[model samples]
Target: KSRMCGYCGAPAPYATACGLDVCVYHTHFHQHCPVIIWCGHPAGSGSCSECEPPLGKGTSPLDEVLEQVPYKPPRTVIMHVEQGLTPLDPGRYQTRRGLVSVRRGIRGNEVDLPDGDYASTALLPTCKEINMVAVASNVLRSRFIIGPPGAGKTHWLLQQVQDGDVIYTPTHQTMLDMIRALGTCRFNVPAGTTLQFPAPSRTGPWVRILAGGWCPGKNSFLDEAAYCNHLDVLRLLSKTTLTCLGDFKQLHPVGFDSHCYVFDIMPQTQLKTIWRFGQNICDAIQPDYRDKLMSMVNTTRVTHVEKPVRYGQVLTPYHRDREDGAITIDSSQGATFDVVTLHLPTKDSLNRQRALVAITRARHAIFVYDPHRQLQSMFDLPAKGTPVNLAVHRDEQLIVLDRNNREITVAQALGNGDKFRATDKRVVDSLRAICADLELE
Candidate 1:
């Protein structure tokens, strides 16, 4: 546990290098231990009159004092409760150690973060299968599990949930689905039908909420760990034996100034096999984000629809919110559809994380209603393999729909380091001029 600020008595968010627990206002001005020496003057260092030599000059008899202040991030951050960083009136401030956290009203809380160290990275020893069970069951250890989509991260986490566990999810949709799966969750119904939660219990895993408090006999599980705020992770680490489970490669925590998962260096387990999509759909995902997603089922389809017909789960990204039953990609995790007709309008509007999550949310087929070749950099449509079909639109002239659905100029396609035969001498001369105007990659 941390102590109150010795200066203002407000809950301390910053600790002085010389071992003073203080609030933000006093962090810079707090008096240090007298034994810890300094220049003995608060004025400009070069103007200290009591000193034999200025701070910039060599001293006759050198006297030295030390100063301290506390991404690529380090694996572990070592701090002490004695320093007052964890009295749990944690701040919303971000630091190299981690977010100071956003806990409040944390009086008389004796527990500090489980260890004197904080986590801020993505590489850790991984565990899965029966060992995964051991990691989740241990009340003494807080584990972080990073599992890509279809890896059944949620399935494993849900199966390990016990009566005393506090399961925290990042979305109300997730909470609804999870509570139903647990079978003990009932709605706030006697008074209203707003699909609301009644109250908190030791066993109640609050939805998308975090603050410092005591949760005895409850081990906390964070689903959609990537989307969970870093502060939430830190607060939970302080309050309960915690387990974080989700994909870091998917959509990150929204509304955050930073997206790094706080427990990246904690004891972590990974689920590699994707139980959701087959090889084709897996291939559709960028190998960079999900290099090892293996699918258990073969009944999967991935496509880009010219016109979306809502024959399946109508999913759309946050930016291209159009379709009638459109569930935003961020909220559609842990759901499997026979076919997912996705409405992606452009490449500029999507990123690897959002694209991967959207494309993989289906079981049978995925059709993106992209009018243009907007998903160019993100997905590799299967047409790239069979052949390069050439078509001439009367208005658009000669065009070869390139691998990524680009209606590339015929001359541009030929410039992709390939040989082509042109029958007309005049057309060939014109094509040469088009080639001269272009710069080859």
Candidate 2:
């Protein structure tokens, strides 16, 4: 072989002498390819036209490295097709207003309330006075006829009885007085007239007759003073339509509790309007407004005396004393007096029953007593004990025994006492015997 080059197998000077067949294409100036391989050789196997440095060559290698990896940009919020966003009609919506914060229990803005006299912002308005007279005239319901002295409770009762309604009095005297006011007399019971229970077979127009006290026993009111049973009468009256006429403060039941038995038995309405007293007297007692006066009647509290009070005209029962030029003399039955000076009675006279009757007699009462005299304190006293039974038993039937101890049945006694006959006196005497058994002490 004529001198061959070693690597590229080219001839030597055209194959260089002794070294190799590293032939130089352009006069042996070195030009290696710049392509890099995984082995990290800067001069790679081969590269020519495409060989170049990276774009960010002046920056860090990390920047050049990160630029080649995949990239993603952030997205925006958008309404999708499945969202179902729709507009609604304006009429279906309501604009609510009231907001209340009730108290711990009570339903109202009790804190920082308005002044006492200010108009109320309550749901229901209060009524101070109701026209009860008009209510009585229209509605047939049983009701109270509360009024101050001279408020015409009896007069109203008389008017009702005249209109063919029944009336029940608490006392025999009151019944006589009412009859006198109704008829042509001066407090007198007429001839052939008596307080008697009607026959069971009798049927007629219910006229103005009197039934005094609650439960009259076998004879019509003859045994009333001794054996009066208000409960028994109430039960009987419950079976019939009846209107009771009496001052609530005047009388109470003898054997039963008034609160449970008396007042609870009836529903009442007040009659504040008065026709009994003149304008001058009415002004003094504060007519159309009896709040203080009624409080005085309740007698639960003390010191009701109002100083600098406007004193009105005084009145008496029968005779007129014109001592004061401003005073008026009124001779009217069932008329209420404004001011009455009551002379305090003995220990015997001072009692719950008497005090109640007298206190209810006047609108504004003035009790007079000698300061030196030991006055009685009227409180809840022992009740009148069980009523006396004045009748005897002949066979199985009950018969009453007279003072002479004569045996008599109830019907016979009542029949004998009818029409205010002389036999009535015998019945009355027998009843008095039973009444005498009642001790006031």
Best by lDDT: 1
Model 1 TM-score? 0.54
Compose the digit string of candidate 2's lDDT tens values, residues 87-167: 211111111111111233223223222222221111110111112122222224343455455556556644444322333
TM-score of 2: 0.31
Per-residue lDDT tens digits of candidate 1, residues 231-314?
A: 344435544567778776677666553343345546766777777767777666646443566678764545555775454567
Give all candidates' CA lDDT scores.
0.51, 0.31
Q: Which clashing pairs does model 2 show?
A: 11-15, 12-15, 12-16, 13-16, 143-268, 144-268, 144-269, 150-336, 392-399
C-alpha RMSD for every candidate: 18.4, 44.6
Cα error, candidate 2, residue 236 (Å): 3.4
Measured by C-alpha RMSD in angstroms, how accurate is candidate 1? Answer: 18.4
> Number of clashes in model 1?
2
